[PDB]
Amino acid sequence: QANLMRLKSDLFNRSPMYPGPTKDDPLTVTLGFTLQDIVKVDSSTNEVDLVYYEQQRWKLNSLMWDPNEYGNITDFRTSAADIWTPDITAYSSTRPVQVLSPQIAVVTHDGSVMFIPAQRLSFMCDPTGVDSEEGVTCAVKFGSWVYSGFEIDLKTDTDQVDLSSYYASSKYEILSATQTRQVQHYSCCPEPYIDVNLVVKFRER
Amino acid sequence: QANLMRLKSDLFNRSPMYPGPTKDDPLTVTLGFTLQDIVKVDSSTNEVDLVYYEQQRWKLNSLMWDPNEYGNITDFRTSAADIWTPDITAYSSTRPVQVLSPQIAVVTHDGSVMFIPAQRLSFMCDPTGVDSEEGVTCAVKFGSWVYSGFEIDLKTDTDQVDLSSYYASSKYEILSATQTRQVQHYSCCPEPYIDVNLVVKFRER
Amino acid sequence: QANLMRLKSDLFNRSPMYPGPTKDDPLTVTLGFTLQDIVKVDSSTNEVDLVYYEQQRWKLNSLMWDPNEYGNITDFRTSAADIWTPDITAYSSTRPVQVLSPQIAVVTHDGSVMFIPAQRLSFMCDPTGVDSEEGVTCAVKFGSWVYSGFEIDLKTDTDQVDLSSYYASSKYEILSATQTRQVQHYSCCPEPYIDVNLVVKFRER
Amino acid sequence: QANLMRLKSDLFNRSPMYPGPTKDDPLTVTLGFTLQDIVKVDSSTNEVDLVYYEQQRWKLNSLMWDPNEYGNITDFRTSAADIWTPDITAYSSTRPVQVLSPQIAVVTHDGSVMFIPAQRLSFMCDPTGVDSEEGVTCAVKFGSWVYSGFEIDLKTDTDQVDLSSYYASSKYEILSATQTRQVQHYSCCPEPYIDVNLVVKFRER
Amino acid sequence: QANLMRLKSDLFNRSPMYPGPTKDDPLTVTLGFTLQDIVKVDSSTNEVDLVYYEQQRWKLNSLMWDPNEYGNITDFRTSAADIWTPDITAYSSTRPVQVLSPQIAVVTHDGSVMFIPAQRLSFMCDPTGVDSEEGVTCAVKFGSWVYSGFEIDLKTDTDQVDLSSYYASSKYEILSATQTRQVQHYSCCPEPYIDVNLVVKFRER
Ligand SMILES: COc1cc2c3cc1Oc1cc(ccc1O)C[C@@H]1c4c(cc(OC)c(O)c4Oc4ccc(cc4)C[C@@H]3[N@@H+](C)CC2)CC[N+]1(C)C
Ligand SMILES: COc1cc2c3cc1Oc1cc(ccc1O)C[C@@H]1c4c(cc(OC)c(O)c4Oc4ccc(cc4)C[C@@H]3[N@H+](C)CC2)CC[N+]1(C)C
């Protein structure tokens, strides 16, 4: 534990925290979703509740170290509060997202960070037709709240949502689930905006 | 990165925080709304729930810098906790407002700040007649809680609520949505009080 | 800005915070209610929900200053957390009160403080008869939780609750609303206790 | 206020906080309940909600002073965060307890502390028979979560629950309410455990 | 009080907090569940709510002392905030866990820690058949959120859940409850992953 304490002190206590990305030093965040359950549909307010894991990854020069200088530590776990993290947010939630897991990240000696919060999210969806063979389609966009594509770029590893852990006995079965990078341009500004579109088709039985 | 780190230290770590405006140093806050959805109407209690983005802009001389002195940085993002923010509040909410987005501001080198919190708001409105073709009109005033017009002035860029992001499968159809600056006068004191009246006429799908 | 920052620095950063009143240096807190809406009535549990502004005023010697020494500043606004506040409490709530407004107060150069929190309160009341013409009466007492009348006295400026802001389209119509200072003797204790009794008579409109 | 400021500084800003009791230096906490209302009875989940004031009293040598040294001050009010407090817990709650009063205590010159949190508690009870002339009996135990009776001894001043403030128009009549110190033997541990059994008999209307 | 104050200062105020385990300095956490009550069952969302006490035990060399040096103190109670605690998490919750007990742990002179948070948990569970003689079986896995079996190994003293405290009058009767260590291996990586599977069979009473 002596070496890890030294490393953390060197990384965190010995310099001002990373002030986030800028156009001159942009960063790429990879997003991936693991859908666990569709827990609730409300057809009187058009709200649907999902439970999922959101995998985020990024890399910072300021979090790099040489394992040989620290007893060959190649990675460590630490509170998310200890590091900068991206402001990735649902764009059409209807209630504050509910965090279901400890806020702890894994940092690797190449400066890469992996952070996987589990969340319950209520978002806007008209669920009518959910009780049919065809099912229904809902969508919610995820992206930075304040950084344009010039500061934060988003990427997915695959366009397919991970369904391997979807609750087998859910009230709702998943027909398809995709996660797709998009580039928007608002008629006010020249910079691109990026989001990842979570599109889920599902039905009752 | 080095220059941004130095700039924030100069802006935030060297002086005390802006103590807010006064009659001698008044401020103008620009407000605007982007209505995403009407998520609930409760006819038993006369409450209606909105989800919206709330644009706020103002400008502080104490947040100014010369880009040439800081590696040509022209603006930056920072936690809204790092800066003074106006106490803009709904005048007829029935529940604490729920914040749906990160609290992060954009600061520009001219001292301008832009802050766009997304919110779920419950407020007083009698929805009677919402299920007619003529619909129903509700209204909520927004303004400073403790500053009069001598200290904080309000403006809208436009009197038209931004509806271009309105949920396309909402239970409710928006007939009109305006945001209008108003000068109030309580028969207690001379100084004027300013508010922005959000007025929304809508009906069931 | 400079003068104000200097004033606050002098009032808040140079001496320990005011530790609250004692018998030898008692304080008077003036209370007043602006009733905005009766939002909910629950006959299953005998709970009624009110939304109101609670106006509080008191005066501290330690908050005085000479405007001439501070650029003619005669008053200022500041976070409620910067100052001592009375522990004024509803005595028969059934849920934690919910705060609907920013916790900011106005401080004046003679040491007077004005604080007006907006709140939603659930309290004990049997609504039986609310649907009639006579309506129903409910009452709730407000006062310090831990200070006796030897340390904090209360008073009202008028025993008439301010209804000039009551929601015109409430489900309930106010027939009467009074706020009355009471002096209580508790058999446990030789000190006088003071409360303000908010009595509201109302019916379905 | 000068004298009170000195006293708090001497009591609080000189030594570490009291680290809580040990077998070598045990502490006795006195508990007393004032039942204000049985708010809710859920027959579908067997949950009952009470509102009560839980009076806690204990005494510490480290909180003692001589009034002659501090301007005849014999007691003072202070934030509960300023002092050690016992971890008295309801043992079969089903939701986190909700605090309804300010977290402030009264400290007296003999080192005695009195802290009276008003709370709303949901707990496990089968309300079958509540709608009979005989009513139903429910019980809830209170005591330290982590201290044995070797470290914290509990007592009541009376076995009779204070019903003098019970809400006159509750949906429920109280047939009886008692609070009884129990010495408990757990087979895990040779040390005695102590709890206070709150037993309430009640019926509809 | 003096000796304990010394001990806490020596354990907590001299060195940095334990930074958590690593592959070189792994840690075993022992878990044991005491099931108090199955409180809710929702067949429209497939969620079930449990109240239980989760015993957690582990041992750090950095928490050891010689009782002879500290007045024979053999163990002490302290806020869970003063120490490192393992990130043990339910893998299929549908809402943030609710904490029902004080966050206070017991530390023993051999460096061992015992911490027993009482909690209400909502987790994914199809209750179909709960209203039958055979009842239904649900399960939820517990483990570290970010540590693999190389860093945190889990174990149970027994595979039988503690039922000695189950609410006698619950709406649901417990047919069986087991808690068993399991070793997973996720396709991506080679390190073992460890969880404790809590399996409850139950029926309406
Ligand atoms: C639904 O569409 C939007 C999606 C998103 C945003 C904003 C969107 O559209 C809006 C954009 C604006 C207000 C309200 C909006 O609803 C701000 C916009 C604007 C101004 C100055 C700028 O600086 C010079 C600037 O860049 C601006 O444009 C953006 C500001 C923030 C964001 C995007 C664009 C991120 C912002 N956030 C949550 C991410 C997703 C002044 C006023 N003006 C309205 C023109
Ligand atoms: C690791 O598990 C426990 C941890 C702790 C305790 C008890 C625990 O589990 C037990 C709980 C019980 C017996 C044996 C136990 O081993 C009592 C339990 C019970 C009854 C009545 C209650 O009131 C009407 C009640 O609240 C009960 O549950 C608790 C009682 C005390 C404590 C917790 C729960 C605190 C008690 N102690 C000091 C703190 C930590 C009667 C029937 N029943 C046996 C089911």
Numbering used by the authors:
A (entry chain D), B (entry chain E), C (entry chain A), D (entry chain B), E (entry chain C): 1 to 205
Give the authors' words:
Cys-loop receptors are a class of pentameric ligand-gated ion channels that are activated by specific neurotransmitters, including acetylcholine (ACh), serotonin (5-HT), glycine (Gly), and γ-aminobutyric acid (GABA). Recently, Gao et al. characterized an extensive set of mutants in acetylcholine binding protein (AChBP), a structural and functional homolog of the extracellular domain of the nAChR. Using X-ray crystallography we solved 3-dimensional structures of strychnine or d-tubocurarine in complex with ACh binding protein (AChBP), a well-recognized structural homolog of the nicotinic ACh receptor.
Remarkably, at least three different binding orientations of d-TC can be distinguished (indicated with binding mode 1–3). Binding mode 1 (yellow) occurs at most binding sites, but with ligand occupancies that vary between 30% and 60%. d-TC molecules were not built in binding sites if the electron density indicated partial occupancy. In binding mode 1, the tertiary amine group of d-TC forms a hydrogen bond with the carbonyl oxygen of W145 and forms cation-π interactions with conserved aromatic residues of the binding pocket. A second ligand orientation (mode 2, magenta) occurs only once in the pentamer and is characterized by a polar interaction between the quaternary amine group of d-TC and the carbonyl oxygen of W145. A superposition of the (+) face in binding mode 1 (protein shown in yellow) and the (+) face in binding mode 2 (protein and ligand shown in magenta) shows that the different ligand orientation in mode 2 results in an outward displacement of the tip of loop C by a distance of 4.5 Å relative to mode 1. Finally, difference electron density at one of the binding sites involved in a crystal contact between neighboring C loops indicates the occupancy by a single ligand likely adopting multiple binding orientations.
